[PDB]
């Protein structure tokens, strides 16, 4: 629908399943995550318009989320080689760490930026505030996490409820609709 090459970013199963259901509905989807082994493949094609791209960004090993922040400037540089060619009009970031990447990108480029929230503290809170303030839309997966965000992080920004679940077709349809809403708001 609406506008073509979209990028989902998950530095660290939410994104993999979303992008495949999105592409089933017709979106051209490139999903980016980090490499965690030097024998990892660079591109995994799932369908003619859906693939996962694994970027070398920090050590070629499994790094847990609580140690990933320092790898993000490298993830931004690796991603910028793909964004330099594909020019993604929409980028959808997953978890606050990928959102830092989205935040850095949005400071340099003009794209529709959506972010999905999920539930060191000093860094996370400042970054989560920056994302809420500058992203076009932040997705929460339950009222309880929306309640937490508004209580403990910030009241700023636009949040939308797309609930946790195992029906990825349904989720993708709701996400797709948001994408198109964002794109039409160009006026």
Numbering used by the authors: 25 to 36, 53 to 159, 174 to 241
Tell me what the authors wrote about this structure, in their words.
In order to study the function of TeSPS A- and B- domains, we generated three truncated proteins. All three truncated proteins were easily purified from E.coli. The A-domain could be merged perfectly with the A-domain of the full-length enzyme with an RMSD of 1.3 Å. Unlike the first truncated protein, this one has the α6 helix at the C-terminus, implying that the α6 helix in this position is important for domain folding. However, in the second truncated protein, electron densities of two loops (loop 1, residues 37-52, and loop 2, residues 160–173) were relatively poor and thus their structures could not be solved. In the full-length enzyme, loop 1 is key to binding UDP and loop 2 is close to S6P. In apo-TeSPS, these loops are likely flexible and appear to be important for enzyme-substrate binding. MD analysis of the A-domain shows that RMSD values of loop 1 and loop 2 are higher than those in the full-length enzyme.
All SPSs identified so far belong to the GT-B type glucosyltransferase family and contain two Rossmann-type folds. The N-terminal fold is called the A-domain and the C-terminal fold is called the B-domain. Thermosynechococcus elongatus SPS is a kind of sucrose-phosphate synthase (EC 2.4.1.14).
